[PDB]
Amino acid sequence: DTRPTIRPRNDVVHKQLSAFGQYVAEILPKYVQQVQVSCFNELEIFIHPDGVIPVLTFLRDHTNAQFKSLADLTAVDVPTRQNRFEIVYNLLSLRFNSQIRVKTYTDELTPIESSVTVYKAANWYEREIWDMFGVFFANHPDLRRILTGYGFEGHPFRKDFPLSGYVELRYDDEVKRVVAEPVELAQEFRKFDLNSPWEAFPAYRQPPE
Amino acid sequence: RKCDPHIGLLHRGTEKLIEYKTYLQALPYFDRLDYVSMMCNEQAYSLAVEKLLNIQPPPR
Amino acid sequence: YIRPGGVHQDLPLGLLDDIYEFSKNFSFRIDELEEMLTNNRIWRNRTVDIGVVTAEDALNYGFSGVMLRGSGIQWDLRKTQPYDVYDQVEFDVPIGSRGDCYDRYLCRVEEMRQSLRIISQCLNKMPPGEIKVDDAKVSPPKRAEMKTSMESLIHHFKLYTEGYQVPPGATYTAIEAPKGEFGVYLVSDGSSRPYRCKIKAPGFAHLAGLDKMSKGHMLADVVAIIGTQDIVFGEVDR
Amino acid sequence: GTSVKPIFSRDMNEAKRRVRELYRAWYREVPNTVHLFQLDISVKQGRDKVREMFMKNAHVTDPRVVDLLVIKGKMELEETINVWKQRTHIMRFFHETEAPRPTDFLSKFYVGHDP
Amino acid sequence: GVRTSPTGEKVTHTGQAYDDGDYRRVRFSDRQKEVNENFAIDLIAEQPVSEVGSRVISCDGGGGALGHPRVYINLDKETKTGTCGYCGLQFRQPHH
Amino acid sequence: ASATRVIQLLRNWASGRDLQAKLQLRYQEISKRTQPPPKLPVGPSHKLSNNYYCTRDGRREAMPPSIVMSSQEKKAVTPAPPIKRWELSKDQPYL
Amino acid sequence: AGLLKKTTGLVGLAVCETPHERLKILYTKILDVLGQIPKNAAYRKYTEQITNEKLGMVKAEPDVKKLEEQLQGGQIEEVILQAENELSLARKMLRWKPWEPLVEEPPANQWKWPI
Amino acid sequence: TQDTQLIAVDEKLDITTLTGVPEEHIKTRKVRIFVPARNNMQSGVNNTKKWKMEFDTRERWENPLMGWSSTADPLSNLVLTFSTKEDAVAFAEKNGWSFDVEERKVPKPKSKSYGANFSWNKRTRVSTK
Amino acid sequence: TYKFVNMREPSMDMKSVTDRAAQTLLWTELVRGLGMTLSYLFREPATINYPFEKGPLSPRFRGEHALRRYPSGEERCIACKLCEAVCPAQAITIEAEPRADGSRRTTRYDIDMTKCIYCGFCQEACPVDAIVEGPNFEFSTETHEELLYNKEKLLNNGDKWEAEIAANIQADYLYR
Amino acid sequence: SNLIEVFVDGQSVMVEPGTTVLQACEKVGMQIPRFCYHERLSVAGNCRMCLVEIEKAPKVVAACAMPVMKGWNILTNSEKSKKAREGVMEFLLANHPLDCPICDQGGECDLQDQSMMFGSDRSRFLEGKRAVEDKNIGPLVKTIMTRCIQCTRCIRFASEIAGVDDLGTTGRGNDMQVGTYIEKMFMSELSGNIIDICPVGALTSKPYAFTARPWETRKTESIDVMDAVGSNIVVSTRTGEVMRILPRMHEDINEEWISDKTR
Ligand code: SF4
Ligand code: SF4
Ligand code: SF4
Ligand code: SF4
Ligand code: FES
Ligand SMILES: [K+]
Ligand SMILES: [Zn+2]
């Protein structure tokens, strides 16, 4: 690189992924709403909520995809979107050493039928997406709590949920049992507003709205 | 017959507080994530963050 | 130590020498273990043919690292997708062919030796140069430059209070952490702080597969399979 | 906008149908739970308490909210009978360690400057 | 230096002083209240006033790399000996 | 090191190898803890000649994801060439 | 071809002693089920492209050892396994039928990160 | 168009009962909304573009030992970000919080000039440049 | 590149099986374990005699914090306020005021030892290198209150370990 | 109607004739970096940070005082525009004193923020910095004139907005000392607002001096009660008390200035 400071880019993978992005797009014009290949050679397949089985089964068993490695499933709670939750699958191909990202919008009540049949790895990887966020997964073997406390109330990763939560424990000599009380902190979280009032990088700027 | 590995007995905010700590402040979290592989976690974080910044570290 | 943009500091003078002395003597210590356990019947019978998995279930279960390589799956992040300088070094990935507890154990001890190979190569080919990027907007300026140059002081000030603002987007980066595939997926909102960070914990998938492991095995073998699954709960519990 | 997905129930009838046997199950479980968990509270207290949390949310209209919270309320009765929770996890529902919070306007005014 | 309060209660450089009752002082008895006998204000005041004959003087504070960020304090106000903000050393200049 | 020769044969014979060649602990071989002061290098873009930040803008050179198909005769391709079967180990293929 | 290799190096996946004709009869089967899906379909055109073409030399070249690099997809014993997976997909998307336009356009600007 | 045994619910959407914000933290929180006001000594305006979800500040008492800001308001240190306000209001309905808004203070367009600083009859002539 | 780790081809000659039968019948491999472990029995231990001898450390070590001061005696901290901003545990809490002289320093530098992480960001934060971690690590205690530090406690520790940390940053500031 | 058409970095936008380059920029959302121009305080044109190259231009135009006409594409992100920004910003920063850890503007300084976005990452200075003797124009506002960048925003504010002529820039060349020359006392009822207009720590509030920092101070919106005008103001609260009061943006009530008593 002539400029060693900035990270070199790989264009060869860029259109090759872009070619594969159109590829999967033409097979399913019913499901694939949006395909996007980012600057860092990462491809994203935006699908409809009821596409968890079809496209994943497509990516898992296709001759030209063979994406059978379920990397992770994550939600991105975005309050300003009418669909707050954004379930994100990550897929990995052993044969083509590439990565696949598919995202589905979902509301709180609207369920997502479980992808356990496609990948059995998602069995445990839904018990926390129901825990942290509260998105319910339909026709799933078990939705048990494995991160939150036994009988804990709420979905902590939701951004309407406080960092300190609501309940704090303490052993009580009156009852010989640790019990919960409303949280009161020794010191409150001194929040910092670090968003500079002067505009950042103009590339990703939103259009005049 | 069956075994249920009830996890959670060490569950922490981690990702929850990362939403409130800056990138530099969030770096020590990964050291405590896979606490036996100290430097390898930060490798993942630094590789990720510098990828978004489109900045590559010097060869040294 | 490992910070975005390189490393925080440079090594103390002579540190490469002492680690070189350790590297020379360490291979003996690996031989020490193999002598102790590898041929011992008691260790094998508590480990061989225990917790075996097929290649397809291991891959479908989301496993990574040794959990796949032990079952014969031909895959390794450093080789297939070489991050950092891992491309300019050769190492022999220890692929097993049984998938039971024993194969992973031999896979690990060979990975110990193959790790020692990396130390030797990077030691004989350690290049000179700076330790962080030459961009104060993401790398704090040198302490000497801090106390003499204004732009260093401003950039140091804004970096330690506001921090660098990361361009918006999403990225799931992947490295082969000795557990397995430790990946971090973060979404940047365009501010100076992360918006949401999800981490791919190799133990999470592995602990998820612990059910299929324990099928048809002794209770005194559940401890054995738990041991080889390289689970640390700080990692699996996030 | 109005048209939406029935996660389990078309109408509040089958939503109220769902709450019934789970209410039946929750009322059947009380004598055994207190027995093996080794508590001091009375069986009726569990019954009148199992009554309690059924009512503070007995005002919704969307059949998704009720039936999603049905599987939510589904999700402790098995968590109890398989002794997964601790004693501290169901006396938590019997909130008892705290002082009784103030109800009259004068009492809040006396305690502090917080509605 | 350090002063003494009516309750003894050796005052700190900040000026904290528990009152007569001040029930929080019960933590102090049977223990000792940690006081830094060296007070910042009166260990810089007696320091000699430097005499440098120039309008602009660098104020790195000794060991430029190891000191404090170097400032370029002005020395023209003959009423008040110009001092570095970081250092606190009072630089005066002889008769312009 | 301290250890007399007769002990050394006992350790060497029991373990089947010589151990005085390399030992678990340390000795005089370590670098002294008072190494001379270093002279760390300068940055590649530390030059006071043409060095405008308009050239290196890693954060600013980033581009939002490229639009390729949006909701609002063909060939068959793959996201990458299929992997290459790596050969066995040259130093020691069969352990 | 040659001597039947003892193991594939992947536990669980065994060695099929008659691989060439099994790969043949699989490839016809996916061609057969691909008859149902109408011509205008893109998925049909894609796999009608790589089936017969990959059915070509497996019909012509009988040496599975050379068949390894003919398909550049690893060992034949899992290529047929992958061929089975393609057959599973043909059965699966014979229900999915994704050739219709989108079920729904994305509600307003739910995309367009950042917010 | 989404024919998976369709149902229609005209009740205004709320999730307060299953989200689980406690009873004294749902009705006793006067949640207000505004566009964040720019700090007046910062000419940059890349802060007056979003909407927030701030709450009402509660009692903040100093810790007896070392003078903290010990506070029993769990919801105090949370602000959300909303692109427009109709999505912001929608969040209020689903969580059923107390409501009040504040319209954007858009800049009235100041007709600037440079020749006005040197006029012949108008007093807009500047006294210093 | 790669290599196999368990491909064993046990030769079926009358020779090797006799060795295999010898291995199982006479516990040869187990005897190796005895002879192996016996070898280290006759070797010296590497057990440091604490506290008569400590472990080996480095000049960059991070331990108990201690606010330092200039050779004149004035405190280094200048209400810089960067330290808590970069501190990822918010243990630092600092409030400044006007001072009588005008060198308006802080009244409070309470850092909670049960909150801090010994991050190392503290020294990198303030340009006047006011707060640093001393090499001490034996500052254990029995009551949680003592671990809660305050401006007097740090400054006292700075006056205590001043002889040590001054040389530590003397031999390490070139790296920094 | 008469709204002249003009392009900005591409996209075209109609605009009232006589509008300067800036005032067309924020119509699409462009905030060109500025130091000497305030939207409700005259036009200075001296900072030269607003300098943006225009299409076909052989010279970068001063965007503040340049009236735009037909079809003038604003090359905002163009290389030479950012080149002009880089040069001019390091010139302003040349003689600036290293006071950020001790300057109250730290964390909310326009000179600090823009150098992060539109600025270099290292220094090329190898000389001695200029030092300006401090002044004293009140116990309500501090004067550290070495931090001044001579944006002249203070003197204009006094001349028109405050209606008092007591501020100016004595000297010549680098000795551009802005103040009152003679010893004077800046008593106006709107005097406290020169703290907010100043982009640097040149003038800061003595009562607030060395008490808090911008990142830690929580902000709340309230009203002024010290006068019947009822000015909208933002209250700074941190650790559970109030430190400083800032005027809010309300063109009908207070614009962005408040009385000294309220501040
Ligand atoms: S200790 Fe350092 S960072 Fe903290 S206020 Fe003092 S100078 Fe600033
Ligand atoms: S002690 Fe550690 S955690 Fe606390 S502020 Fe210093 S570096 Fe951060
Ligand atoms: S004016 Fe800004 S850049 Fe200058 S010292 Fe003050 S805060 Fe730092
Ligand atoms: S003192 Fe402040 S307002 Fe006045 S000219 Fe200088 S920078 Fe501008
Ligand atoms: S805005 Fe044109 S020079 Fe300040
Ligand atoms: K100012
Ligand atoms: Zn100084």
Put simply, the answer to whether A94 touches C73 (Cβ < 8 Å) is yes
Whether the CB of J199 sits within 6 Å of ligand 5: no
Q: List, in sequence order, every residue forming a beta bridge with E90; answer none if it has no partner.
A: E83
8 A C-beta contact, residue I132 and residue I122: yes
Whole-angstrom CA distances from A99 to A26, A71, F65, G102 are 19, 9, 16, 24
Residue with tokens 């590898």: C38
J247 at H interface, C-beta within 8 A:
yes
J55/D79 Cα distance (integer angstroms): 70
H98/H54 Cα distance (integer angstroms): 12
The domain ranges of chain D are: 1-115
Half-sphere exposure of C154 (CA within 13 A, CB side): 28
- Write out chain E residues lying below 8 Å of J102, CB-based: 85-86
8 A C-beta contact, residue G29 and residue G22: no
Three-state DSSP class for residue F69: strand
Whether the CB of J96 sits within 6 Å of ligand 3: yes
Q: Which chains touch J (3 or more CB pairs under 8 A)?
A: A, C, E, F, H, I
- Write out chain F residues lying below 8 Å of B55, CB-based: 58-59
8 A C-beta contact, residue E2 and residue I156: no
Put simply, the answer to whether D114 touches H6 (Cβ < 8 Å) is no
Q: List, in sequence order, every residue forming a beta bridge with C177; answer none if it has no partner.
A: C180
DSSP alpha helices (H): ranges in D12-104? 12-37, 43-55, 63-81
8 A C-beta contact, residue C139 and residue C6: yes
Angle subtended by helix axes I151-160 and I162-170, to nearest 10? 70
Residue J25 is assigned to a ligand binding site: no
Nearest-CA neighbor of C130 among C116, C117, C118, C145? C145
Quick count: other Cβ atoms within 10 Å of Cβ I63? 17
CA distance A134 to chain D (A): 10
Please report which ligand is nearest the Cα atom of J65: 5
Resolution number, Å: 3.6
8 A C-beta contact, residue A121 and residue A70: yes
Q: Is A115 exposed, middle or buried (0-12, 13-18, 19+ CB in 10 A)?
A: buried
Whole-angstrom CA distances from J163 to B13, C128, J160 are 56, 63, 5
8 A C-beta contact, residue I123 and residue I60: no
As separate numbers, helices (DSSP H) first and strands (DSSP E) second, chain E gives 0, 2
Angle subtended by helix axes G19-33 and G64-71, to nearest 10? 40
Those residues whose C-beta lies under 8 Å from the C-beta of residue H121, and which sit 6 or more positions away, are: none
E37/E13 Cα distance (integer angstroms): 9
Three-state DSSP class for residue A129: helix
A151/A153 Cα distance (integer angstroms): 6
CB crowding C142-151: b at 16 or more within 10 Å, else e? bbbbbbbbbb
Element (H, E) at A74: strand A69-74
Nearest-CA neighbor of H53 among H27, H79, H82, H25? H79
Those residues whose C-beta lies under 8 Å from the C-beta of residue A4, and which sit 6 or more positions away, are: B56, B58, C134, F44
Three-state DSSP class for residue G10: coil
Chains J and H are in contact, defined as 3 or more C-beta pairs closer than 8 angstroms: yes
Put simply, the answer to whether D7 touches A111 (Cβ < 8 Å) is yes
Give the phi and the psi of residue J27 in degrees, each rounded to 5. -60, -35
J106 at I interface, C-beta within 8 A:
yes
Which residues have C-beta atoms less than 6 Å from ligand 4? J 148-154, 178, 197-198, 200, 202-203
J223/J234 Cα distance (integer angstroms): 8
Element (H, E) at J179: strand J177-179
Put simply, the answer to whether C91 touches I173 (Cβ < 8 Å) is no
Nearest-CA neighbor of B56 among F62, C6, C78, C127? C6
Span from the CA of I130 to the centroid of ligand 1 (angstroms): 6
Half-sphere exposure of J192 (CA within 13 A, CB side): 20
Span from the CA of E63 to the centroid of ligand 1 (angstroms): 19
Put simply, the answer to whether I152 touches E34 (Cβ < 8 Å) is yes
Nearest-CA neighbor of C159 among J9, J215, B60, A52? J215
B33/J55 Cα distance (integer angstroms): 53
G105 at F interface, C-beta within 8 A:
yes
**Minimal Cβ distance to E36: which of I74, I100, I152:** I152
Three-state DSSP class for residue C24: helix
I104/J101 Cα distance (integer angstroms): 12
Those residues whose C-beta lies under 8 Å from the C-beta of residue A77, and which sit 6 or more positions away, are: A84, A85, A86, A133, A157, A158, A159, C196
Chains I and E are in contact, defined as 3 or more C-beta pairs closer than 8 angstroms: yes
J51/J65 Cα distance (integer angstroms): 10
8 A C-beta contact, residue I106 and residue I78: no
C189/H81 Cα distance (integer angstroms): 11
